């Protein structure tokens, strides 16, 4: 298997590949989350250099992970699908074994854990 340590420390203590991943996020369309007294709203910019789009079918920016939890994102779209698919699988696996849907904190911790794992594993960015 391809094994290279891609995320590594530099002399100043930074992991440049992680920081460069942040720049990809900074380049992504804006997304915002505001929580009310009795709700949460997720808002998302969609850049307008694209007309002739088909809005029916184009992947929407907010994804349902389970019927009670949603995930939005800024950054590389193709990357986001991988995190969403894993999150959706874990959501069903949690219901199967614990007989209760995920807490938002749990689901977040899982997704966060996946992201961290890709920062100290060989062969991946």
């Amino acid at each position: 298997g391809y094994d290279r340590a891609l995320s590594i420390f530099s002399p100043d203590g930074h992991i440049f590949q992680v920081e460069y991943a942040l720049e990809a996020v900074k380049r992504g369309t804006c997304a915002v989350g505001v929580k009310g007294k009795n709700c949460v709203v997720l808002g998302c910019e969609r850049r307008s250099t694209l007309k002739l789009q088909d809005t029916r079918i184009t992947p929407s920016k907010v994804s349902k992970i389970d019927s009670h939890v949603v995930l939005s994102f800024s950054g590389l779209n193709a990357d986001s699908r991988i995190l969403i698919e894993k999150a959706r699988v874990e959501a069903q696996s949690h219901r199967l074994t614990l007989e209760d849907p995920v807490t938002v904190e749990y689901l977040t911790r899982y997704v966060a854990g996946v992201q961290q794992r890709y920062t100290q594993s060989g062969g991946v960015r």
């Binding site: 349902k64 992970i65 389970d66 019927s67 698919e85 959706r88 699988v89 959501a91 069903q92 696996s93 219901r95 199967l96």
Partner: protein, 195 residues
């Protein structure tokens, strides 16, 4: 386990499933629901080897729920039944096969038709107006051959089912402790509380 039936009428599918769970010479439970909702308009009843039954049902349930979330869409009964069959067809040549028989009752919203699928542990699928697994069928199939009509109402279906349960309660050697009855139609899945 043992008794699971299904009848498809004009506008709904009705599943009836025995309530007893017996291990040895003891009825451990008389209120067991041998069914899982796979999607809002699809219900699966099941019977077979202890443990295997629920483990399989819940595994299928998890898989269909995952699909629903991923596509924000509900698989047709035909699609679900085909997925289930394939899963069982794999299982039969495994190291340890799932020994579970199932009925899948669903309302297809695109066609506005109810649908009943009978599938045994080998992955043998058939669509039927009425179906059963185990010894049940040896009494009920002949009775439904006689009294069943394709244009029946949900209420006519329930009475037809009451006949089946009456016969089983007369001639079956074991006390299966009555049935839980569920109706699957255009408005989803509901449970008849008095039967």
């Amino acid at each position: 386990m043992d008794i699971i039936l299904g009848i498809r009428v004009q506008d709904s599918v009705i599943l009836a499933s025995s309530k007893a769970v017996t291990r040895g010479i003891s009825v451990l439970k008389d209120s067991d629901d041998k069914t899982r909702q796979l999607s809002p308009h699809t219900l699966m009843s099941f019977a077979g080897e202890a443990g295997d039954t629920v483990q399989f049902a819940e595994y299928i349930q998890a898989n269909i729920q995952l699909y629903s979330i991923r596509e924000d869409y509900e698989l047709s009964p035909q699609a679900v039944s085909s997925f289930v069959r394939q899963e069982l067809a794999k299982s039969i040549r495994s190291r340890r096969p799932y020994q579970v028989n199932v009925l899948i009752g669903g309302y297809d919203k695109k066609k506005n038709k109810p649908e009943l699928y009978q599938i045994d542990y080998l992955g043998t699928k058939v669509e039927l107006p009425y179906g059963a697994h185990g010894y049940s069928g040896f009494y009920t199939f002949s009775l439904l051959d006689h009294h069943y009509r394709p244009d029946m109402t949900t209420e006519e279906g329930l009475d037809l089912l009451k006949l089946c349960v009456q016969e089983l309660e007369k001639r079956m050697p074991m006390d299966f402790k009555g049935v839980i009855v569920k109706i699957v139609d255009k408005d989803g899945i509901r449970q008849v509380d008095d039967f």
